[PDB]
């Protein structure tokens, strides 16, 4: 271990020394190694340190100078692995050691997840047995063919077949092992380690209790190491020791998400002095994870950093809150498996990976959506280990049988948004431990009094459709869906989120409660069909509230025509946001091409020739991308783009909106300059035959939803139906 | 409602109200006390703590109680339930409040009252009218002593556990007393008088408590933990108790700490401890200030002139030592740099480095010596260390580069030579910045310059180091690349273009080609697209996987931050995606069965203005080509291709709905049949597969069917289309119109495009004609208790389903046995098309016979296949059918939970028909009898049955010997027999029929092997899950399947034999069996 190059904040546990020892001896004797162990067993770190420690002649130590040079050839082992991949890796190292010094240069293979493809459907690890004896198969054994092998696995491995190697089957890290690793990780600074040495043993005891508590392997060693590094960094930055809030924050951050685990209670029981009696919520934990400090990552190298975050949710709600009250200043890119018709998955994941790489190099946050298709191309970047060079971090990103190092900026954060069920039953535990878990589904952000706002608004909008009238001889009960188009028994939560975000101040003064309730009412009625707002005179609300809400619906809010809405929108400024994104739901027919021409005709002052986009033709994502690129490229200011989406038709353009929306915003975030405003409007045509109730709710966050009855202006009828309520048909024909 | 809203938030509702109206104020108080209650999903408490917490935290309950107790004319009229609740609240308060006069109070409620002192004092003064001060102060003092001793225990436990690796100490009873939570009665603390208070922490003696007090006084003192650890090493395993640790381990530590104390107090310390115990305070003193202040905490003595001058000595010694280190490293880099020069002030410095001194005072003569090296840096000498140990690097630079100007071109020579990867392209820049920074001492250095110039150069290097603190690491990782730095200047022709350069090349002159290769290999998407990159005249071909990994490589290029590179790479990626997608739609069409794209081929010129070049494998239609940008042309071509695919699936569904017999074969068998039937002398594969409709089809009957199917009216129509089409092609200027019209005419009139095949209409007519010549149609009535107009669902049982079906079909004695039609033996992952074909065969009007159509093992179909099958069945019953069909579905009795058994619950016949085993046996054995005058291989068998299953309880008996002796008995008669004996050893588990089919293929596709061939299948004992389906498919149904290829038909005259060793036991008895014994 001492001969190997040093690394600060590395623990001298029996684990790490044992793996690097067995590794250096086996690849010297060319003996297969089958290092297994639970996540956090330092097998991969052992592989990296062995690779960078056994260079032949330029070795830092004289003992590694007298030893051979090693050139491994990595090969990630996804469960969808083929024996051709390992055969190719073996042939590659056979060429590598061909013609070089056998006694000073040796090339080996590493299958970082070999245990994963033990039950792959394509029988991948079934020709490895002859391979690890005579170098290659279906050919003569020969020199420059014998190759080492380190079958690293994070899962229990079949011993019968792989007996020919050396099974270093790491056991469960014992309490003494955990305290030793605890001492070794904080070795970077001698001074604070002697201040924080006491907490180490109870930490290990509590960690073993929690790991043996749940049968599921939801928590592991990586979380413990992150916890100890986090407390190390907090103490060293604070320089005065530890306050209990820091310890509880650390354990909460690195231990959370699991439903049946009060890990805070478990840790604080063994640490009665480290109690906290105040409430700390998930929102500030996310804010700390995603926004590290200016004093953070400000000294030499990056040894102490947070993990990438994995929010656990349900009903795909995380994005709304995250885009409401966290993603401030700079909006992170959103990556997803685009749902546009006839897009090949391989090209899409390649493009997503390229965008990920661009974001990492630049240093702009990434928010993922699908991991069950790009987990094998990220866990190395989610390993958070860096191959330093020139003082710059570099990580491994892999595409198929091709792994390549790539730059990572020092200001870069990653968020994976997944639901509770999918992670708890489909997510691999190594990914779980590589990712800092956190649950923020729908209620965590929501204060209890905000839940009361939700229920009061629920009962307020449940009787908004409750109208009993004999103006017609008919009995048809109105659902709250039809009065407020989109409402889906959940839109109250999203709308109150929007309301509190709009208020911003976010305190309790008994005035903010009233005003957030009233703004929530305004946002509800802003998506209300005009017929409902005029029936509201006789509905169970009353007949003064009816007048007031009709006034707000026809005077303050703009709902006559799309063009009037655009004028009112572009006239006013915003919350310093370079762009404002609005969703429009309509019953009239979608614009047909001369309408946008006249639309610009009375928008000759502000708009920049808005372009309409039909979503039935974009049988590829890149058609939409190139259209958006062209619209951003054309000169002007305060440009406007409109996307039509007829939900009532034979087409499938119903869920595709989702993909399109992200794409558009993504394009702006990566294709808009720094000197032009942008307004994106998404328009959809709905019917009154029930398709106006089966439409999803108020997609919150970065979409201001609103409802326009008819897009086209009306010169014939007046633009204010309250006067038409006042007057009769006779009064419409009076002479001057 | 409004007060419920207001108290739902944490605001105050009533604070200064002038509300002398008594009844109405009582009503609003009832509202607040029924709506400010701690609701927890609907009146759950069953406890008193939460009520007390709400009592002590709410700013309106104390005002409410005040107002209700001021006058007696308000409480009387509030509400029955509200008065009940406030009576409960007052009772709860009285219960928790009579408790504080005693020790029965709980600690949690006690801290709760201490954190709401004002609320609690007001409510207690309120309840007094129906001591407070002294009782509460005494109680809080008792709590303070409680927490003091608890923290003493905590710190002692933590310190004794920090050395837990050396020694174990049993903590009397505290190890369990301290373990439990703080939810116990205060009376357990036993605050006694006559004074001392012995609590639940049974401290052995107050000496342990005062030791704990001192230890907590130096719990954080780093020096104290070092002393305690080194004195704990003196014991070493040992299970030792608390009382003897005080003098075994604590007393020596405290004594050493006390003596070292008076040693620093005297200022007589020596340098040995200075560099022995103060070695971790390098360049950090403020926390050392506080640590040394913690040092003076233990002794109740002042600190006025003790830490300041002593920490000054510490910092001056540290500065001295770092100055020695800097001086030695600067001399080292000097002597390695080759400069003689002169400093003439560091010789006394190194002489002192070779000196040893013992005193803790101020070196006074060394002030001037260290003046030149006071504040160089604590960092930044590592850069010079690296410079010193990298002699090879600087020697190579001064043997290769030697100047600053040519570097500007040198890195350029590197940039082309460097690889495409991010590491490869960043190597050049890191080396460039390293040499740019280090030219301060590497280029401005003469063999003789004085001290002042050296220091000025060091200063300008310092100001070159302020913006990039990684410069030494850049030097390190550039020096580690010395071989590349050597080979870049002597670079030969690097023959590897790039990932991005080859992107530009393939974009410049790429030729994508789709061929549907005429060679024998499959039609997989990998082998249907190739790429041509021409040049000279060399032309490199590219496969799909090579292109995909190319996409990976150029997708992981570094950051060039230019429009050209990213635009061209994404253009190449986009054209590749569209090309793959056209391949996707084309292969979907090919697997649908087209005959128009079998000889299709397409060249796509990735070059700008390169267009497309279509081609069809017929002489009567000329080539089709376009021009223009490739991306929107390809988008249009793909849209049109998908629309044509939809129209083609529609037209094949419609045409299959008209001819029944053309619903027999799968789509690829349709294309093969259409190809083959035009041959004058068709091969034996299609003859065999026609023997499943006509039966024993021959050339004469097939030519009769293909000659009496067409009329000269069809020929006139084809001549009309031929004379009409080319001007229609020339009518539309661009290719899109002529493409649309050629594909439309293909849909309407196909057979003229390829006068070497048959369209769907001609095929259906031919099959119908073969049906007409092949008479004696097959009739099969239903069993008793089975309805004849609706699905007949049966849930038999996994070991009875197959005999159930074989008994259902028994009710037609002397009727020809069923074949792959009307009897579908389902397996997991069965193609949907086969069940669609079965449903069609059972619901078409043209059948010239009533037959029972059975779907065995229905639950074994997958979920999605079952869903599609049920959707198709409902649709086909919706459009039209014949309402006399016999449909039987069989499922497994224990597998009712799957899709198709669950969806036929209403259509259930809970009858489960079956027949006695001898009846099924007689049925099968009699129906296997080969009639005389056929010259069959069954003549040697037990009088002509052509099927035998050979089994035995244990192996090694001679079953194979029986097979071979039967073969040689046949050889004995009918001399010159040359009878083949095929052997197939089905051996893998999860048995596959395709292997045995393929092994059987080359044997009757020749017609010169029509002679009796005694086949002999054999099996291995690792086939556990695949015996019955295959046995019944081959021996009973007489067919062998493949989703996309020819069909093998068991024939009446080729003897078959299946060995099987010893669930299945009942099954083997069905067939005419032979068994052997030791
Ligand atoms: N000895 C150690 N001391 C401190 N931290 C360690 C030690 N070994 C590993 N770690 C931590 O573990 C992480 C690296 O783990 P690593 O990738 O090597 O996992 P592994 O147990 O080898 O398994 P896998 O094969 O899944 O990668 C880092 O976050 C690092 O801080
Ligand atoms: Mg045998």
Give the gist of this structure.
Chain A has 736 residues and is α/β, with parallel strands linked by helices. At the A-B interface, helix 7, helix 14, strand 10 and helix 17 of A face helix 1, helix 8, helix 11, helix 21 and helix 23 of B. Magnesium ion binds next to loops of chain B.
Q: What tags apply to this protein structure?
A:
736 residues, binds magnesium ion, alpha/beta, 39% helix, 27 helices, 2 chains, five-stranded parallel beta sheet
Descriptive notes:
The structure is cut from a larger assembly and holds 2 copies of chain A. Chain A is α/β, with parallel strands linked by helices and 736 residues long. Chain A is built from 27 helices and 17 strands. The longest helix of chain A is centred in the N-terminal third of the chain and has 18 residues, at 221-238. The radius of gyration of chain A is 31 Å and the shape is elongated. Bound molecules: adenosine-5'-triphosphate (ATP) and magnesium ion. The site of adenosine-5'-triphosphate (ATP) has 23 residues of chain A, from α2, α6 and α9.
Report the oligomer.
part of a larger assembly
Radius of gyration of chain A: 31 Å
Which of globular, elongated, flat, extended, rod-shaped describes the shape of chain A?
elongated
Query: Which pair has the most extensive contact?
Result: A-B, 57 and 65 residues
How many angstroms separate the termini of chain A? 102 Å
In this entry the ligands are: adenosine-5'-triphosphate, magnesium ion
Binding site for ATP (chain B): 956-961, 1059
Organism (chain B): Mus musculus
Cross-link (Glycyl lysine isopeptide (Lys-Gly) (interchain with G-Cter in SUMO2)) (chain B): 147
Subunit structure (chain B): Monomer. Interacts with UBE2L3/UBCH7; UBE2L3/UBCH7 is the most efficient ubiquitin-conjugating enzyme E2 for the ubiquitin ligase activity. Interacts with UBE2N/UBC13; promoting 'Lys-63'-linked ubiquitination of target proteins.
């Amino acid at each position: 271990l001492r001969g190997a190059p040093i690394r600060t904040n590395i623990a001298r546990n029996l684990a790490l020394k044992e793996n690097v020892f067995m590794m250096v001896i086996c690849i010297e004797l060319k003996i297969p190694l089958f290092l297994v162990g639970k996540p956090g067993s330092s097998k991969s770190l052992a592989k990296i340190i062995v690779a960078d420690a056994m260079q032949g002649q330029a070795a830092f130590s004289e003992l590694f100078r007298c030893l051979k040079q090693v050139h491994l050839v990595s090969f990630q082992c996804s469960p969808h692995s083929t024996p051709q991949g390992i055969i190719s890796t073996f042939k590659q190292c056979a060429r590598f050691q061909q013609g070089k010094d056998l006694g000073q240069y040796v090339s080996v293979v590493v299958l970082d997840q070999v245990g994963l493809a033990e039950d792959s459907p394509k029988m991948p690890l079934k020709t490895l047995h002859p391979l690890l004896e005579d170098g290659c198969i279906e050919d003569d054994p020969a020199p420059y063919k014998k190759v080492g092998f380190v079958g690293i696995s994070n899962w229990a491995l079949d011993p019968a077949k792989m007996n020919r190697g050396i099974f270093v089957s790491r056991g469960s890290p014992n309490e003494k092992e955990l305290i030793e690793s605890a001492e070794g990780i904080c070795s970077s600074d001698r001074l604070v380690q002697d201040k924080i040495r006491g907490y180490f043993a109870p930490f290990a005891k509590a960690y073993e209790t929690v790991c043996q508590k749940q049968d599921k392997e939801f928590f592991g060693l990586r979380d413990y190491y992150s916890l100890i590094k986090m407390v190390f960094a907090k103490a060293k930055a604070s320089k005065r020791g530890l306050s209990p809030q820091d310890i509880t924050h650390a354990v909460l951050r690195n231990f959370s998400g699991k439903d049946n685990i009060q890990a805070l209670s478990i840790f604080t029981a063994s640490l009665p002095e480290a109690r906290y009696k105040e409430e700390v919520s998930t929102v500030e934990l996310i804010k700390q994870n995603i926004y590290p400090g200016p004093q953070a990552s400000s000294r030499g190298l990056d040894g102490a950093e947070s993990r990438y975050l994995l929010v656990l949710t349900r009903n795909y709600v995380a994005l709304q809150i995250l885009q409401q009250t966290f993603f401030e200043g700079q909006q992170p890119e959103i990556i997803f498996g685009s749902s546009f018709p006839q897009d090949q998955e391989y090209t899409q994941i390649c493009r997503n990976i390229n965008r990920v790489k661009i974001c990492m190099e630049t240093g702009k946050m990434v928010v993922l959506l699908n991991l069950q298709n790009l987990y094998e191309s990220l866990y190395d970047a989610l390993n958070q280990y860096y191959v330093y060079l020139g003082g710059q971090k570099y990580v491994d990103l892999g595409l198929g049988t091709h792994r390549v190092k790539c730059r990572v900026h020092t200001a870069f954060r990653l968020i994976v948004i997944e639901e509770k069920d999918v992670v708890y039953k489909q997510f691999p535990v190594p990914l779980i431990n590589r990712l800092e878990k956190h649950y923020l589904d729908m209620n965590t952000v929501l204060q209890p009094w905000q839940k009361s706002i939700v229920q009061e608004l629920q009962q307020w909008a449940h009787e908004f459709a409750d109208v009993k009238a004999d103006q017609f001889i008919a009995r048809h009960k109105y659902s709250p869906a039809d009065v407020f188009i989109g409402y889906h028994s959940d839109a109250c939560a999203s709308v109150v989120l929007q309301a509190v975000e709009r208020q911003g101040c976010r305190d309790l003064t008994e005035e903010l409660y009233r005003k957030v309730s009233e703004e929530a009412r305004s946002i509800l009625l802003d998506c209300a069909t005009p017929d409902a707002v005029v029936r509201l005179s006789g509905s169970s609300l009353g007949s003064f509230t009816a007048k007031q809400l009709s006034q707000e619906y026809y005077y303050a809010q703009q709902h006559n025509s799309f063009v009037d809405f655009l004028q009112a929108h572009l006239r006013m400024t915003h919350h310093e946001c370079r762009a404002v994104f609005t969703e429009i739901t309509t019953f009239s027919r979608l614009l047909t091409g001369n309408d946008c021409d006249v639309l610009a005709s009375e928008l000759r002052g502000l708009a920049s020739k808005p372009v309409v986009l039909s979503l039935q033709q974009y049988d590829t994502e890149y058609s939409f991308l190139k259209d958006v690129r062209s619209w951003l490229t054309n000169p002007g200011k305060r440009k406007v783009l409109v996307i039509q989406a007829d939900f009532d038709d034979g087409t499938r353009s119903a869920q595709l909106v989702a993909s399109a929306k992200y794409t558009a915003i993504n394009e702006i975030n990566k294709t808009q300059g720094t000197k032009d405003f942008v307004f994106v409007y998404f328009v959809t045509k709905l019917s009154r035959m029930g398709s106006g109730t089966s439409y999803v709710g108020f997609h919150g966050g970065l979409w201001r939803s609103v409802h326009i009855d008819d897009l086209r202006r009306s010169t014939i009828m007046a633009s204010d139906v309250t006067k038409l309520q006042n007057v009769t048909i006779s009064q419409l024909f009076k002479p001057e | 409602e409004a007060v419920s809203s207001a108290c739902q938030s944490q605001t105050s509702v009533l604070e200064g109200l002038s509300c002398q109206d008594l009844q109405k104020f009582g009503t609003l108080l009832s509202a607040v006390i029924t709506k400010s209650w701690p609701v927890h999903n609907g009146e759950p408490v069953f406890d008193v703590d939460e009520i007390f917490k709400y009592l002590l935290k709410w700013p309106d309950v104390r005002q409410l109680f005040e107002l209700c107790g001021t006058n007696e004319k308000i409480i009387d009229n509030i509400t029955e339930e509200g008065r009940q609740l406030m009576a409960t609240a007052e009772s709860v308060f009285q219960k928790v409040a009579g408790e504080l006069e005693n020790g029965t109070i709980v600690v949690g409620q006690l801290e709760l009252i201490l954190e709401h002192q004002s609320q609690f004092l007001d409510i207690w003064n309120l309840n007094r009218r129906r001591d407070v001060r002294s009782l509460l102060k005494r109680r809080r003092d008792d709590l303070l002593f409680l927490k003091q001793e608890k923290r003493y225990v905590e710190s002692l436990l933590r310190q004794l556990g920090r050395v837990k690796h050396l020694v174990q100490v049993d903590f009397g009873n505290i190890e369990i007393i301290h373990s439990q939570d703080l939810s116990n009665k205060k009376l357990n603390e036993a605050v006694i008088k006559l004074s001392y208070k012995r609590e639940t922490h049974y401290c052995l003696s107050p000496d342990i408590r005062e030791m704990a007090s001192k230890l907590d006084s130096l719990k954080d003192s780093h020096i104290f933990q070092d002393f305690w650890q080194e004195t704990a090493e003196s014991l070493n395993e040992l299970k030792v108790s608390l009382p003897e640790v005080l003098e075994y381990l604590y007393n020596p530590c405290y004594d050493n700490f006390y003596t070292l104390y008076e040693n620093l107090k005297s200022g007589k310390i020596t340098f040995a401890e200075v560099d022995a115990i103060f070695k971790d305070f390098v360049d950090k003193y403020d926390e050392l200030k506080n640590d040394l202040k913690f040092m003076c905490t233990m002794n109740p003595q002042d600190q006025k002139g003790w830490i300041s001058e002593r920490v000054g000595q510490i910092k001056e010694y540290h500065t001295l030592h770092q100055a020695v280190s800097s001086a030695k490293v600067i001399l080292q880099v000097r002597r390695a740099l080759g400069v003689t020069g002169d400093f003439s002030v560091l010789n006394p410095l190194l002489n002192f480095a070779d000196s040893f001194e013992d005193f803790g005072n101020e070196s006074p003569q060394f002030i001037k010596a260290k003046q030149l090296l006071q504040d160089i840096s604590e960092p930044r000498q590592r850069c010079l260390e690296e410079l010193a140990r990298q002699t090879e690097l600087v020697a190579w630079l001064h043997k290769a580069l030697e100047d600053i100007n040519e570097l500007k071109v040198f890195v350029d020579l590197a940039s082309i030579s460097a690889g495409e990867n991010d590491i490869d392209v960043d190597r050049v820049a890191c080396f460039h910045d390293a040499v740019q920074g280090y030219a301060s001492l590497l280029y401005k250095m003469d063999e003789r310059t004085n001290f002042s110039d050296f220091m000025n150069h060091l200063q300008e290097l310092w100001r070159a180091l302020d913006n990039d603190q990684h410069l030494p690491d850049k030097l390190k990782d550039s020096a580690r690349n010395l071989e590349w730095l050597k080979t870049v200047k002597e670079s030969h022709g690097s023959v590897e273009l790039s990932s991005l350069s080859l992107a530009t090349a393939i974009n410049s002159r790429g030729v994508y080609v789709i061929e549907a290769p005429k060679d024998g290999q499959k039609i997989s998407p990998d082998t249907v697209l190739r790429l041509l990159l021409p040049d000279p005249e060399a032309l490199r071909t590219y496969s799909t996987e090579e292109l995909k990994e190319l996409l990976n490589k150029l997708m992981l290029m570094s950051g060039k931050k230019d429009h050209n590179s990213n635009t061209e790479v994404e253009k190449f990626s986009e054209v590749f995606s569209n090309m793959q997608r056209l391949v996707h739609v084309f292969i979907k069409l090919h697997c649908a069965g087209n005959m128009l794209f079998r000889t299709w081929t397409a060249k796509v010129y990735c070059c700008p203005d390169g267009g497309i070049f279509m081609n069809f494998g017929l002489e009567l239609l000329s080539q089709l080509t376009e021009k223009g940008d490739v991306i929107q042309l390809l988008g249009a071509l793909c849209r049109q291709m998908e629309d044509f695919l939809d129209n083609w699936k529609t037209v094949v569904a419609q045409k299959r709905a008209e001819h029944f017999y053309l619903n027999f074969y799968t789509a690829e068998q349709l294309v093969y049949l259409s190809s083959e039937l035009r041959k004058p002398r068709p091969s034996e594969a299609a003859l065999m597969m026609l023997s499943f409709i006509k039966g024993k089809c021959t050339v004469q009957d097939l030519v009769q069917a293909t000659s009496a199917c067409e009329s000269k009216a069809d020929r006139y129509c084809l001549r009309e289309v031929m004379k009409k089409l080319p001007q229609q092609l020339l009518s539309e200027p661009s290719l899109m119109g002529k493409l649309q019209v050629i594909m439309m005419q293909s849909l309407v009139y196909m057979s003229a495009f390829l006068p070497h095949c048959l369209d769907l209409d001609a095929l259906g007519r031919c099959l119908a004609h073969l049906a007409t010549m092949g008479g004696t149609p097959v009739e099969r009535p239903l069993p008793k208790g089975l309805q004849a107009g609706q699905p007949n669902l049966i849930l038999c049982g996994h070991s009875e389903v197959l005999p159930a079906a074989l008994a259902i079909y028994m009710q037609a004695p002397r009727q020809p046995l069923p074949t792959f039609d009307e009897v579908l033996l389902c397996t997991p992952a069965t193609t949907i098309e086969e069940v669609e074909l079965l449903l069609r065969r059972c619901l078409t009007s043209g059948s010239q016979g009533h037959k029972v159509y059975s779907l065995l093992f229905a639950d074994q179909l997958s979920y999605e296949v079952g869903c599609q099958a049920e959707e198709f069945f409902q649709s086909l019953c919706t459009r039209a059918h014949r309402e006399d069909y016999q449909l039987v579905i069989l499922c497994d009795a224990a597998r009712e939970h799957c899709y198709i058994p669950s969806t036929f619950s209403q259509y259930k016949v809970p009858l489960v028909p079956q027949a006695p085993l001898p009846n099924i046996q007689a049925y099968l054995q009699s129906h296997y009898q080969v009639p005389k005058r056929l010259l069959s291989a069954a003549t040697v068998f037990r009088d002509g049955l052509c099927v035998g299953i050979v089994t035995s309880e244990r192996a090694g008996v001679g079953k194979s010997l029986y097979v071979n002796t039967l073969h040689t008995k046949l050889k004995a008669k009918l001399r010159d027999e040359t009878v083949p004996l095929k052997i197939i050893r089905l051996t893998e588990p999860h048995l596959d029929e395709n292997q045995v089919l393929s092994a059987l293929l080359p044997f009757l596709k020749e017609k010169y092997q029509k002679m009796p061939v005694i086949f002999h299948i054999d099996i291995s004992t690792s086939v556990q899950t695949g015996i019955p389906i295959f046995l019944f498919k081959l021996l009973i149904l007489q067919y062998l399947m493949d989703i996309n290829g020819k069909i093998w038909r068991r024939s009446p005259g080729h003897l078959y034999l299946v060995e099987i060793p010893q669930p299945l036991f009942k099954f083997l008895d069905l067939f005419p069996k032979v068994t052997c014994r030791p």
